[PDB]
Amino acid sequence: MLFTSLLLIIVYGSLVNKSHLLTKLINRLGLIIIIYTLLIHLNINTLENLSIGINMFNNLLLINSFNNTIIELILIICILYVLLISFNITGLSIIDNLNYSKRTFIVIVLFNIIGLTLLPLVNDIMILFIIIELQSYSLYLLTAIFNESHNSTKSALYYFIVGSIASFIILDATVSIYDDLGLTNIQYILMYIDKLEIFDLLCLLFGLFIKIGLAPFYSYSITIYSLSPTIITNYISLMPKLSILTLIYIIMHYINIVNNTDLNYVISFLILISMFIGSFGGLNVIRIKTLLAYSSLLNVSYMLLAILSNSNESIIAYIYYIIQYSLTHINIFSIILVISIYLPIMNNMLNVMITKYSPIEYINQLKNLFINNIFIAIALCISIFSLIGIPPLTGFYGKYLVLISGLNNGYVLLSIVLIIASSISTVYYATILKVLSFDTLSFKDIISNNLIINTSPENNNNEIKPEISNVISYVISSLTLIILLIIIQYENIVKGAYLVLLYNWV
Amino acid sequence: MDLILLMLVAVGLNIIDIYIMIEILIMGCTVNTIYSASLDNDMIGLIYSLIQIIIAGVESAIGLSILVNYNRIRNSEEIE
Amino acid sequence: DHVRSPNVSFDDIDYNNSQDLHNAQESLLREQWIRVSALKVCRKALESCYKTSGPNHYEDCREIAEKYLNMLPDHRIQGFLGYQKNDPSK
Amino acid sequence: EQFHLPQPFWPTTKTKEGEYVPKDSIREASKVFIGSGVLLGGMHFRRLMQYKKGSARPGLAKYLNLFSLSKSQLIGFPVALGAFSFLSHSFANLQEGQTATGEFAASSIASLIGLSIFRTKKPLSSNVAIAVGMGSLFGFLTWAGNFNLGDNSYRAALEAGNGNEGGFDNKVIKTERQGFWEGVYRRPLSQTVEDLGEGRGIITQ
Amino acid sequence: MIASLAGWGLFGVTVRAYQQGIRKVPFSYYPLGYVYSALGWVAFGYGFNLWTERNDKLLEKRVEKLKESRNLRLS
Amino acid sequence: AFNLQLEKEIRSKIDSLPKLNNVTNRKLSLTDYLFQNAANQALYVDNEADLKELDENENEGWEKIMYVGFVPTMILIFAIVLFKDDKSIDEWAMDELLLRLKEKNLSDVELIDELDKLSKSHVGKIGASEINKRDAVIIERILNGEYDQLSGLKKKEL
Amino acid sequence: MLVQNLIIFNIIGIVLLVLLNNNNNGILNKKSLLTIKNELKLKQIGLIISIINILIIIENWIGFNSNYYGFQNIERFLNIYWGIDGISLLLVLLTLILGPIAILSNWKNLKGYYTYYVISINMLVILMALNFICLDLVSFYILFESTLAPLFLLIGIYGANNKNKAAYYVLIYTLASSLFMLLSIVIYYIIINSTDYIYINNIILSINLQSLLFIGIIIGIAVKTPLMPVHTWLPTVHSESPLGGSILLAGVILKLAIYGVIRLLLPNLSEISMMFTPIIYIISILTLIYSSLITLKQTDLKVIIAYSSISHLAVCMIGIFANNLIGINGSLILCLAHGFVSPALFILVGGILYDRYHNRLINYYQGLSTFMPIFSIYLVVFSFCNTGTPLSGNFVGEFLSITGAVIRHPIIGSLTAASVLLSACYQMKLTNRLTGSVFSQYLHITNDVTNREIFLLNWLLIPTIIIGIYPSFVTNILNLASSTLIYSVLI
Ligand SMILES: CCCCCCCCCCCCCCCCCC(=O)OC[C@H](COP(=O)(O)OCCN)OC(=O)CCCCCCCCCCCCCCCCC
Ligand SMILES: CCCCCCCCCCCCCCCCCC(=O)OC[C@H](COP(=O)(O)OCCN)OC(=O)CCCCCCCCCCCCCCCCC
């Protein structure tokens, strides 16, 4: 349904006249295609039947209940992202018309969802390399979709080079595996899981570690995320980790058969180093996207401890964490795409150049959001409080579940560092909350009419004029209450994760 | 010798020189696969090599397209 | 009304039965509070004698003073965690 | 009769008396010192060739300068690691097994030897504060059980029958002490006295 | 089971009520909005309870096998 | 009693003397805060805020609540700790000590004579007190022998 | 009933207050009726909810049985088992009582946004009140850490000149340490597969593993009841937080750490609590002596009371770790008595003086007993109560805690008696200076204590002297509950 509709959108888009209304309407055709895909997927795919694991397409693709969880999650998060490009994020024509200037935006996104959803299912080194390129090529194109922008093109060039080296490392590990065994199917390799150099699978992981931005490779991800348009950074900083971390978990599932300790020490060396950089790095930053880039690295460090431990509680910790972290990430970026309407306008010093690609770029552009919109400020406060790990939000249960998996497997050193690194990172999450509210009472009664939102035309002066569009507001509210009120249905959700199996059985 | 990272001395100082090093690096992977496949008399390794050559070509085209638009973006006055 | 103590020992029950274990803890607490109540009664007898005897308080209050100084170390609340979690026989 | 203080230590693989064949403290440090010297020395010359190829370029010299090691560092670093590996192994033989205080002692001194070479123009107090700081990190890294507890993890104990998979019972008292991760309903009183000692409410008043 | 969908619907009313504040509009604005947001989450709430009841049936059967495996381990 | 025109009198009386920084019959209801429309509520703001403008820490809006809602809560707390039929553990242990004397000394006529004639109110003051009651037998019986089974609960010895 | 009525009503109240205030935001400027008199209607609804919260618990206090051993009023709400025993009931009563007083203290001394303040105060009180009635470590931790989100915002929004430093202190000190309490809670869930209080009370762990869990938990406790050397957050936060935030942060938040010992250390880690009790005494005796001496050299008025809070809490920890009923009952009565005297002083120092002169430096205030006599009567009266004068509820708590300390350890536990002398040094020096010599030449004659500020003082003094004269009100509830905490085998 995804592939067939993609061809129809490719042909149709190249026929009709270049205009914003038609570009925005085609973006609403893709929102249907992704919705239709989820209905067909959930219809045939069930947890109860995919438990054993089912080979598809001459064993090239293997699907089980652990992979199947993430495909539905990926489809869901791709619906919430397409809602941004398909509806108004602000309603001001100047800021919004950027999302509709490109007709191939939705096509490239639909290309990536095919790439993302097939990566966890791969079961052959021949198709592992092909699928990882299909996902990797789609990201470079999306990073350069705004080809007029100098920073966007400079980022895609940086992205392509780093990913090309990353893909070469992945390709070289598979070749080395084929050299030793002569087999391509992953199941056939499992028969020789004790007879092959287990470090050649680690060389495979080193390639997948680059693509998720893990230190010492973290440098490029921070640069890329702080240069792309905020609508682009909202996608490329979350989606690759959804499908690669699922793949990394499976590869580590096979690896722990021989339980090689040297493999675990090197990965612990990278997890430990990344927590240090992910925490101390964000202390001295001014750009919000650079801040969320360091925040992303720290959460990936937590999620690797659940992957590295790889027990029965590690499935629960990973499955829960990857879901709550995606909703938190969408909620935060959606707010940053909206609160740009409250920016002031000059009528000077420090010569800060703002562009239509990142209207909100600095942390102090969040100033006085407690005054301009109190309800959305709390939503950003609740979201940041989840990242801090304050209970009983979603973020606490992610760290609590990760700690169970980590300590149950003897990772005492990493468990303590993650709890040190969490507190160090609380400093720079607290700065976002300091900027949001702390200067409320001095600014309470101010004469503000130079905001960007004050350039909106007055329609009637009799009817009520809401400040924020309908769809984006409903998404922000829904994900803010889900983050806040997870305590109500937490027991059902966690018991719904006990059933996700990866060859546990009995 | 290469443990001191000698190959960094062998890569030129232009973005196009990096692109070539990526191709020469991947070329080594394909040659390794052709070597194993022929010794084993296995055509599955030759299917892999054929895919690697085709996939390594698509990677070049996208990289050059980004580089080409990167170049014209500076030379974009065009006010004549 | 006056609830009767559930006279029960830690040495005859299964701690897996947390209902019976509760009674073994409640029964060991109630007996100890009786000893303090017994102790406070004995001390009252000492006080009358000393006030009434005056100079002869060393004689007319001899065994009460002896007994009170004997019951004092052990007629105090000690809880049940000591005996529940420890095995004197071993 | 000594005092009774708590023992907050994660379990370790105990080596039987007669086990633990020691390892050559000279040879082990020789490999790290010589090896690290060639790598750091070799990478320096390699980075010098990159300097010759490009000098006027701002970005290339921007990155090459970060990795550059001063002439003291190219000498101080190999000595410190060689000193670190010698002192870490040597203290392992003295203790008949690696301990946190041995790793603290090796790391702090080795840092002091190293820091005094490539950080001469700083007060000696400033170095000792840094060396003691770096000592703590290796003390805590060893105390935490290296990167992983390994066989002493609860998962390993559970997979070996030494976990609480078997429940608890009051009628089954174990004369010997229970394992690190194991829990019991009731304990032999002699284990309490051998831990708490007689006195403040144990046995006597 | 209607009370379970009652709670889910009341959560639907809260989201629409919380949407008004973000948009900065009076809470009586467009009263049909609260019906749509309520019914949307009752549809979600209806399915969510179906999913959890399905989990109970699956988890009871899996635990039947896990108990047997533990007994073999505890031999 | 919103009295829309009562504001216009305040409006007119103020309007006649526009100079600023140079009454009792005003009292709203809960209806005027919510039911009333903005325009009629709009004028009320100016009258009330600027009435103070032309100016001893009394009638601050709390005395009606705390003196009616908070203080009776304390009386309810103070009452409960005074006249509640909660039996503390030690007061139970005193009645239980005597209830065992009756059960353990049923052959003793004189002992039961003092327990019988005793009232349930004076159980808590056995010994020297203002009450003219006889308890020498009660005190004497406890002294001679113990009436607890603390060793009876402990079936394990060193 | 209880928790279900306590959450659902408060959530309904919070929603009601938000609906009323934010209705008029819209696209147009609003001059509504609810803003008139400084949000007075919205402050009243906040004050009523505080009073109603007390009525909910009393409905369940009547049913409480003092002769039953075990948790009562057990109920399950949100897949969490709750309940009340003797110790928890009284602390819940203290927490909810400070509700109306914290709100009343800030009635007309904030520059605005009273509705936000009123919601936060009732939110913090409920979170702390619910923390005494849960029955598992995980739920204890959830409520133990959830109070940071409102408290950090409240101190930052409404704080004094250094509110940014104070906000960055409470958030990080009480999170970087309580995360160590999360580790020991997690390990309980890994080996035992449950964190319920009753289930984990019956398990004995290896004496090595007992030492690890104790060190983790006591790290999280030594910060909440600030023990030297990790006390540096409390003096700073007190001197900068709003007055109502100081009443809760001193009245209740510190006592959550003494209740942390009662649930998390004594029952389940009983063997290792005996070992650490000598070490706990060393830390607390040095906390008692150093905090008293440091107070002698302070200048900020509201800091001076902050350090007096640390000296008393050190005595409370000394008593609770004594293995007898005398020390445990004394420690808990002191926590209740300190729960009224400590907030009263901040009203006198940061709520009556600071609302008139807006300066906390001690140098400006002397001879205050001339033109402010009613203030100086309460400052004198509360100075004595703060220092264990025999008729107050603090003396009963301190004497028993000292008595229990000597019983547990006659030699070093006797040094607790230095609390009687040192508490009179820094305190009486502060009172003697304030109400002595001629009236200050830097201040100007103004109103004496207002009628509202008298109401706050009288109802923090009245509970203090009832517990002093007749402490058996507290004891009759505690005795059977506090007797389950004692670990001793006598043969
Ligand atoms: C014809 C020869 C051509 C030239 C050959 C020399 C090439 C120059 C490169 C320097 C030589 C050292 C590195 C050589 C390969 C790495 C060493 C290795 O592979 O391990 C072998 C050696 C010990 O091996 P062994 O324990 O005896 O194995 C048998 C066990 N029964 O392991 C060793 O300990 C050897 C010494 C290595 C220690 C140096 C590194 C220690 C840490 C310093 C940091 C180096 C840079 C850090 C970069 C990390 C980046 C994240
Ligand atoms: C052998 C080749 C040379 C060594 C290469 C090492 C590669 C592995 C490093 C992993 C992290 C990659 C860091 C990025 C590359 C850094 C390269 C570098 O050294 O640049 C120098 C930089 C500072 O440059 P600067 O000193 O100001 O200028 C020198 C003037 N000649 O110095 C730095 O910024 C380096 C510090 C970056 C952050 C590293 C800290 C990682 C955390 C380690 C501590 C973990 C503590 C955890 C506690 C428990 C464990 C003890």
Ligand SMILES: CCCCCCCCCCCCCCCCCC(=O)OC[C@H](COP(=O)(O)OCCN)OC(=O)CCCCCCCCCCCCCCCCC
């Ligand atoms: C600004 C501050 C404002 C507040 C200041 C408050 C000061 C008021 C002083 C009183 C303080 C409260 C104490 C009175 C209330 C408690 C009374 C009580 O508990 O009596 C218990 C006593 C024994 O109990 P029981 O025999 O079992 O039967 C009683 C059933 N309720 O039952 C009895 O038979 C006792 C009968 C009462 C005896 C007289 C009580 C007088 C209390 C005041 C004097 C206290 C003792 C003297 C202290 C002065 C210094 C020496």
Ligand SMILES: CCCCCCCCCCCC(=O)OC[C@H](COP(=O)(O)OCC[N+](C)(C)C)OC(=O)CCCCCCCCCCC
């Ligand atoms: C401005 C406002 C501020 C906030 C005010 C507070 C609002 C409180 C609303 C009360 C609602 C109510 O009562 O919910 C009751 C209902 C139904 O409960 P039940 O039938 O018993 O189901 C069982 C519940 N157990 C376990 C308590 C018995 O649960 C809900 O819908 C839960 C809320 C949704 C949480 C998100 C999880 C689902 C999405 C999964 C993706 C990760």
Ligand SMILES: CCCCCCCCCCCC(=O)OC[C@H](COP(=O)(O)OCC[N+](C)(C)C)OC(=O)CCCCCCCCCCC
């Ligand atoms: C018992 C637990 C229930 C759960 C409560 C969840 C909070 C969400 C409330 C949203 C309502 C709203 O956004 O409304 C805003 C209200 C009232 O603002 P105001 O002063 O009237 O308006 C101001 C503007 N004016 C005056 C110009 C009109 O302030 C609050 O939010 C206060 C409570 C939340 C603060 C801390 C949030 C931390 C969350 C994490 C906790 C673990």
